[PDB]
Amino acid sequence: SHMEAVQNRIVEAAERVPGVRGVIHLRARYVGQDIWADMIIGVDPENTVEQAHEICEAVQAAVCGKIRRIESLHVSAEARE
Amino acid sequence: SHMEAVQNRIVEAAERVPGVRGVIHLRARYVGQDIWADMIIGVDPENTVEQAHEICEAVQAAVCGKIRRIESLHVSAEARE
Ligand code: NI
Ligand code: NI
């Protein structure tokens, strides 16, 4: 439930990035005191693959800048209406 | 040093509020799993007392909204150049 607080922070930080149409999936786990996390964001189907990659990379920087314990974060994108 | 992370978050959140001219002082302590904290912000000497009170109250809401473990936060203001 310290983990719930962290997950909340991840979702919230991802959701503030331009182009994010929700957090579709988030798995977070501790590896010692560090967090490793895997997430899928929604994106406009009409974005280019390159734009979706940009948004992912912006999510990664936004989330890692906010949540200093994260030491690995993978972000993928899926079309969401 | 989990406390350092929390203090950092408090300062950072206070500093993003309009009218804050730094965090002059921050004392934070755990009361169980909750944080109680006392802070002093800088404010423009030419602000009114009422504006300084507004900024304090905005700091309180900004910090408490960001840092869910805080259950008591006092914010005061001092002139800062
Ligand atoms: Ni690239
Ligand atoms: Ni008032």
UniProtKB/Swiss-Prot annotation, chains A, B:
Induction details: Part of the probable 17 gene mamAB operon.
Ligand binding (Fe cation 3): E78
Cysteine disulfide partners in this protein: none
Binding site for Fe cation 1: D38, H74
Listed result of changing V49R: Loss of magnetic response, still stabilizes MamB, CTD dimerizes, binds cations, dimer interface is tighter and twisted
Result of changing V49G: Nearly wild-type magnetic response
Places the protein is found: Magnetosome membrane; Cell inner membrane
Binding site for Fe cation 2: H53
Knockout-associated phenotype: Single gene disruption has no growth defects, no accumulation of magnetite, forms empty intracellular magnetosome vesicles, decreased levels of MamB, mislocation of MamC in 1-3 foci or rarely in a shortened chain. Magnetosome vesicles are fewer and smaller, aligned in a chain with the filament, only a few have very small crystals. Other, possibly precursor magnetosome vesicles are visible. MamI mislocalized to cell inner membrane or in 1 to a few patches.
UniProt region (C-terminal domain (CTD)), positions on chain: 4-81
Domain of life: Bacteria
Comment field (misc): This bacteria makes up to 60 cubo-octahedral magnetosomes of about 45 nm in diameter which contain membrane-bound crystals of magnetite (Fe(3)O(4)). Expression of just the minimal mamAB gene cluster (MGMSRv2__2365 to MGMSRv2__2381), including this gene, is sufficient to form a minimal magnetosome chain with small magnetite particles.
Domain notes: The C-terminal domain (CTD) is probably responsible for hetero- and homodimerization; it assumes a V-shaped, dimeric metallo-chaperone-like fold that can open and close. Val-49 forms the hinge between the dimers. Binds up to 3 divalent metal cations (probably iron in vivo); upon binding there is a conformational shift to a tighter dimer. If the CTD cannot fold correctly the function of the whole protein is decreased, suggesting the CTD confers functionality on the transmembrane domain (TMD), perhaps activated by ligand binding to the CTD.
Quaternary structure, from the entry: Forms homodimers via its C-terminal domain (CTD) in the presence of metal cations. Interacts with MamB via their CTD. Isolated CTD forms homodimers.
Function description: Essential for magnetosome formation; required for stable accumulation of MamB. May nucleate iron crystal formation. Probably binds and transports iron. Binds divalent cations, possibly up to 3 Zn(2+) per dimer in vitro, probably iron in vivo. One of 7 genes (mamLQBIEMO) able to induce magnetosome membrane biogenesis; coexpression of mamLQRBIEMO in a deletion of the 17 gene mamAB operon restores magnetosome vesicle formation but not magnetite biosynthesis.
UniProt family annotation: Belongs to the cation diffusion facilitator (CDF) transporter (TC 2.A.4) family.
Protein's UniProt name: Magnetosome protein MamM
Residues of the full protein shown: 215 to 292 of 318
